[PDB]
Write a protein that binds this ligand. Structure first.
Ligand SMILES: [Mg+2]
Ligand SMILES: [Mg+2]
Ligand SMILES: [Mg+2]
Ligand SMILES: [Mg+2]
Lengths: 105, 179
RNA sequence: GACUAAGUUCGGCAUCAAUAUGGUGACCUCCCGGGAGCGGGGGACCACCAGGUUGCCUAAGGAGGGGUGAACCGGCCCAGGUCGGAAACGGAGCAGGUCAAAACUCCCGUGCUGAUCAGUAGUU
């Protein structure tokens, strides 16, 4: 239950910083989905679980392609980093951003 | 061609406001008159209306700047505009002193124009508080008006004399600042 | 009738820019704290505002007065609802309210500019 949250808004290049986004547009992507996010995180060997029915507070678009939240574990609950490659939320996001595009395209 | 500046302004001014100091009305009067003049008129010169017209241009600006100073009494943002109108008033006055140096206009009118140009010039510098430059212009004005007054009888010279009486307070103020 | 300037009346066109200080709104890019909504802080840029100096500025360019600000596009306050939350509370924001400060627009002033009326004068 002590896992960092991650909304797809954080990575969406068609959203302003005030609309949620957490990473520079240059590194961001178009319309990332919680599904896409979970898949690229898990596939690197991260412990991730997907909450299909959480919405972003700042998200306004009531249709399914923008719903969803991805929870990720960084820590084994002895305080140590599950992985050394992923110390921070930002380190997660930037990676997901880097990996999502190799899927569909 | 002929144009009696000081007499014109003094009679226009008194008939359309400046009896009570209403520079709005008089400026309006200058504007409308300028309409009539250009309408009738519409290479240096032919008639003497051209000279009357440019004077009205200098009069409009001058009167405005004066309306403005009554207003900038409380609205210092207007004082900026005041000084602009006044600088414009001189531009039209210079442009006037430019037209009256054409050799189909008598020297009496030459005198008036350079005396008028001096009056306004005196006024601008007096508002910029340029006390030496302003007093130069006020004496230049006083000198020329005195020159005009001698060449006429005392009756004709009355107008000129009251105008130098009129600017004498201005002359006095400049002095006590260069003391 | 011709010349002279007033009076009457309704239109068209048009309406500059730079500095110092503070302000607003956006947008971009970094840190820092957090399980969320979110919290702390460094830069970059843009728009507008107030009002303090001004000009290689005007034919004339007020630092006026208003109104709209909606079917989603301004900012603010936001019932409900809603998203986040164990909750406190918060986000986004509707109905409604509201504006020095998106954008739009009318009025006043100012400038040019058609025009009206009396057959009015002043003087023939
Ligand atoms: Mg961050
Ligand atoms: Mg108009
Ligand atoms: Mg900023
Ligand atoms: Mg301003």
């Amino acid at each position: 239950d002590r896992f960092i949250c991650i909304y797809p808004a954080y990575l969406n290049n068609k959203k302003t910083i005030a609309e949620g986004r957490r990473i520079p547009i240059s590194k961001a992507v178009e319309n990332p989905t919680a599904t896409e996010i979970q898949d690229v995180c898990s596939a690197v060997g991260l412990n991730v679980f997907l909450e299909k029915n959480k919405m972003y507070s700042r998200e306004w678009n009531r249709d399914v392609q923008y719903r969803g939240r991805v929870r990720v574990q960084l820590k084994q609950e002895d305080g140590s980093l599950c992985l050394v490659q992923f110390p921070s939320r930002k380190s997660v996001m930037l990676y997901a951003a880097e990996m999502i595009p190799k899927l569909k395209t | 061609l002929s144009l009696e500046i000081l007499q014109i302004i003094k009679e226009s001014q008194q008939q359309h406001g400046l009896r009570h100091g209403d520079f709005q009305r008089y400026r309006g009067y200058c504007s409308r008159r300028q309409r009539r003049l250009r309408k009738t008129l519409n290479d240096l010169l032919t008639d003497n209306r051209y000279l009357l017209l440019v004077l009205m241009d200098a009069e409009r600006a001058w009167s405005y700047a004066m309306q403005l100073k009554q207003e900038a009494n409380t609205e210092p943002r207007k004082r900026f505009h005041l000084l602009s109108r006044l600088r414009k008033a001189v531009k039209h006055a210079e442009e006037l002193e430019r037209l009256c140096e054409s050799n189909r206009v008598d020297a009496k009118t030459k005198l008036e124009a350079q005396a008028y140009t001096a009056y306004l010039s005196g006024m601008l510098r007096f508002e910029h508080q340029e006390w030496k430059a302003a007093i130069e212009a006020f004496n230049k004005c006083k000198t020329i008006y005195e020159k005009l007054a001698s060449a006429f009888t005392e009756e004709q010279a009355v107008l000129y004399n009251q105008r130098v009486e009129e600017i004498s307070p201005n002359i006095r103020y400049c002095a006590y600042n260069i003391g």
